[PDB]
Amino acid sequence: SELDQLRQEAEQLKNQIRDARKACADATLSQITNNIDPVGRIQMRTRRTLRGHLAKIYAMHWGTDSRLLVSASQDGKLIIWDSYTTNKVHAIPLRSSWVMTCAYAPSGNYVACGGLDNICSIYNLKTREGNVRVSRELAGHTGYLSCCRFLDDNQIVTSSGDTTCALWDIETGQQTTTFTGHTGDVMSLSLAPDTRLFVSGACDASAKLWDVREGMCRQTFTGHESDINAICFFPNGNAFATGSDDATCRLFDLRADQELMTYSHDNIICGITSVSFSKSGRLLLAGYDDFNCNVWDALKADRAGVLAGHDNRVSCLGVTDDGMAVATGSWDSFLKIWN
Amino acid sequence: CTLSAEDKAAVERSKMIDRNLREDGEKAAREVKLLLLGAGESGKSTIVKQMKITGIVETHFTFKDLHFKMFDVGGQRSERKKWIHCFEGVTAIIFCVALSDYDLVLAEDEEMNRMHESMKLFDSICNNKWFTDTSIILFLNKKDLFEEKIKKSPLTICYPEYAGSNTYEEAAAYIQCQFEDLNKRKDTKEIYTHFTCATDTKNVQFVFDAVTDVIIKNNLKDCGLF
């Protein structure tokens, strides 16, 4: 029929695309990086362990100055720590206990948190009275919230749970532009340093590249066996790492739209939760539910030291902007700061 | 001892915040939590109505010096595999199944009967890997239609193997056994199988008896004797 022939054109185009992707690759990245040496064997010890939560921990985002951080937990509490002295600057009681994401504005005034309630709550921090208030309540998603990030004090990008990712304006709760291309729920997203493009990772084993102004998906990448649970960017805005549940991690390049080194081990059998880079993009720290945190080498697929101090699984991790710390949060209520 | 004035004030704020946080946690710790997996848009709603007298909707009732919190996840329309791990410490799972649900059209497939997908959803949670210790209660709801409908059509339409003669008691026993057999870990958890109705306000009391039993037996195992 007209539909049958449309699927035929679709499969023809699917093959035609793979033509060029193969036609571009000349030699593997692991073939070029034979020359450089091992990076070392990095062992870094825990410096501060801070304990105030009474449940699991599901999110953690560092500030814009590498001194303040915010942690979300199952009981309705969203603390705002101070990493140097390990005090507690603030403590926010929530409206719904069930939470799955936090976020810290790049200026320093706002903080966001949203979970299974389907709503995203923006919290004002510097007010005349002296208590933290709820400024807006953003509604419009039909599912749960996976990850929300800030562009400035007035715009925010939220990765839903049905199929969508939307861009908001804060003063008027209405949403401006909605990105609808996926086939399964979205789990994580990372923003580019230029702040014009962003990526998202679904549960149909895919990652896409969007355009924050135009509203179309320019590139789509494949090459996994199961869902993707984390995505980060290279400090240079040209490559992004992707975690998964098939125990592997992978590095993709936007200018080529190929795949690259596959940081897999034969002993690992479990999936991963979070993924980040370091300054200059030489290391790729990952978190595993085998109660571990492994450190790969972004240039040669070889492993380096590992970080093990946790009783239960690791849920989120992140590095700073000065590069002097990495923090990891577990289902055991504790949260640790590494060096 | 090298701290300044503002540092001492800063740590005083932290000590007070921590104390307040611990108190609130203790307050919330002594309050039983429940989960309500409907497994069908028809049966569930009545029970929450009788007990009271977007996404998650939570209800809060009291009975005989014990505070309850119920969570419902009816409308989510998402893969359950991703968010089900949030409910690990719940004391019980209230489950609802209809009786008139047999000989229904299913509105989508017209090849499968409703009670079969009910059984599949039952298995999925009774044998899940997080819910091994957590108990279950079955509130088989719409009997008022069952007594009327049993005589017109037998239970053989929805079941190949025989259910005996067609009388309310035998059919109720058979539908109950089909579910009760489904648990594999027969030594860890238990099922409580009430035959509820649309009246008489005993349905709130059955839950109190059940949850009391589960708390006391769990403590008995936690300390020695059992």
């Epitope: 001194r67 101070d82 600057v89 510097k126 | 300044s4 503002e6 540092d7 005083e12 704020r13």
Partner: single-chain antibody
Framework: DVQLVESGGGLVQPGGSRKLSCSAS????????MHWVRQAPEKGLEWVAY????????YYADTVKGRFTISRDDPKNTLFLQMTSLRSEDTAMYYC??????????????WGQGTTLTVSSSDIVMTQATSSVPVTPGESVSISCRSS???????????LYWFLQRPGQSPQLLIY???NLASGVPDRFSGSGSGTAFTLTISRLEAEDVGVYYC?????????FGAGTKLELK
């Protein structure tokens, strides 16, 4: 609004006692810690008492170590101060203030409206060498302040708060730790200091800048205010 108001006053012969009360209006009184400052007829300020959040630490000044007592009532939103044996050197306004202490916090934001009291008939001294200035409108002018001990600390930040007071009002907070700037204050003023010699420079002189200017320190606890520096329009 952050409105704060004080009450009690009148004349009391030596040895008598009175009591002062302050009522707060809508700023979450329980979290803040309050102080009590003073002002003789035509003189500088000085710091009389203190009480924290939680009625924990209590601190007093030297002259009033034994005569005065301070207390707070968490519900009902009021602050009290009771003076038992009264001498003749306490005829002054009494000016409540507020203060919240955390990482980025700005102490001494708000200031009361004051009362009056007429009876009958180590420390870090800070100088503010100049007394008065012939300042003319439209030109930049600067004010000096100094100290005995270096106010810098091992943490990394100094402690020098500048204030401003127009004739017939209550003080405002301008720049809290040197080179910061308080909310709602125009962008003209500047911190610009280091070690043990601090200054303050304003770009243009509008008419409102007339008044007195004080400098406070906040490292060690008996808190010393400087004298005045007056800016005369001419």
């Amino acid at each position: 609004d952050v409105q704060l108001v004080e009450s009690g006053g009148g004349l009391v012969q030596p040895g008598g006692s009175r009591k002062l009360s302050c009522s707060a209006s809508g700023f979450a009184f329980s979290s803040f810690g309050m102080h009590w400052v003073r002002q003789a007829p035509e003189k500088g300020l000085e710091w009389v008492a203190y009480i924290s959040s939680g009625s924990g630490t209590i601190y007093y000044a030297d002259t009033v170590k034994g005569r005065f007592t301070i207390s707070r009532d968490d519900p009902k939103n009021t602050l009290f101060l009771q003076m038992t044996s009264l001498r003749s050197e306490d005829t002054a306004m009494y000016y409540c203030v507020r203060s919240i202490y955390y990482y980025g916090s700005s102490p001494f934001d708000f200031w009361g409206q004051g009362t009056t009291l007429t009876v009958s008939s180590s420390d870090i001294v800070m100088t503010q060498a100049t007394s008065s200035v012939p300042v003319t409108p439209g030109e930049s002018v600067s004010i000096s302040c100094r100290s005995s001990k270096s106010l810098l600390h091992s943490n990394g930040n100094t402690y020098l708060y500048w204030f401003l007071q127009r004739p017939g009002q209550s003080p405002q907070l301008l720049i809290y730790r040197m080179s910061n700037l308080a909310s709602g204050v125009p962008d003209r003023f500047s911190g610009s200091g280091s070690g043990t010699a601090f200054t303050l420079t304003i770009s243009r002189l509008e008419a409102e800048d007339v008044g007195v200017y004080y400098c406070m320190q906040h490292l060690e606890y008996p808190l010393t205010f400087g004298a005045g520096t007056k800016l005369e329009l001419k």
